[PDB]
Amino acid sequence: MTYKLILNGKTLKGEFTAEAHDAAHAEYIFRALAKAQGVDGEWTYDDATKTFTVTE
């Protein structure tokens, strides 16, 4: 299934989609993406829209 990430960093910003088996796998992928970019903050997940956000 397709999941979305909105990455709202101070100087790094993005919207991504990933194909993942389930939400736990999407979360894993997106958390690793944000961590490699040095972006951490408040995380959100909305199952109805299959959307994660991270805001610094």
Binding site for Na ion (CB under 5 A): 9-10, 27, 56
What the block records as the tokens of 45 is 């997940």
Asked whether the beta carbons of 1 and 50 are under 8 A apart, the reply is: yes
- Between residues 19 and 22, which has the closer beta carbon with respect to Na ion? 22
- Between residues 19 and 35, which has the closer beta carbon with respect to Na ion? 35
CB of 6 to Na ion, least distance (A): 14
* Cα-Cα end-to-end distance for the chain: 27
- Between residues 14 and 27, which has the closer beta carbon with respect to Na ion? 27
